[PDB]
Design a protein around this ligand. Structure first.
Ligand code: YMA
Ligand code: Y1
Ligand code: ZN
Length: 122
């Protein structure tokens, strides 16, 4: 029962500047996640080592409609490349209790990104 989750890349949203909406993405394995450049200047990229072991890395083009197939269970931390240090990230939680979530929380990342991450988790 494969489902698509559409995510918008925005200069401004609910949580402030440079956001993915939603920035928590709840998915099942086999679902898809579509990133939409609603405003110009965004893309989506998996953060090095912040996808589940078994998952494959990716980096979309700026202003590209990009669809990701989330086969492997676990947590994905994605960033917009230019806006990463401004907090432009999304957490994709695939299946229950995503295994590498504590790992991603511990991993090295900008304070401002940590802030947004902990907020979405909470
Ligand atoms: S696109 C990234 C992911 N999937 C995948 O299976 C990638 N493969 C790379 C082959 N490599 C070694 C295979 N391997 C060793 C390992 O990583 O434990 C067996 C396995 O994928 N287990 C999964 C991850 S915790 C090199 C590598 O990327 O590590 C294809 C493959 O033959 O598995
Ligand atoms: Y592998
Ligand atoms: Zn951006």
């Amino acid at each position: 029962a494969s489902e698509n989750i559409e995510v918008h890349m925005l200069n401004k949203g609910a949580e402030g500047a440079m956001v993915f909406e939603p920035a928590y993405i709840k998915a099942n394995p086999g679902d898809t996640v579509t990133f939409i450049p609603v405003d110009k200047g965004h893309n989506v990229e998996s953060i090095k080592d912040m996808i589940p072991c078994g998952a494959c890395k990716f980096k979309s083009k700026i202003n590209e409609n990009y669809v990701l197939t989330v086969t492997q269970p676990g947590a994905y931390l994605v960033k917009c490349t230019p806006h990463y240090a401004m907090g432009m990230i999304a957490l994709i939680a695939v299946g229950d209790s995503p295994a590498n979530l504590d790992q991603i929380v511990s991993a090295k990342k900008p304070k401002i990104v940590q802030e947004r991450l902990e907020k979405v988790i909470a």
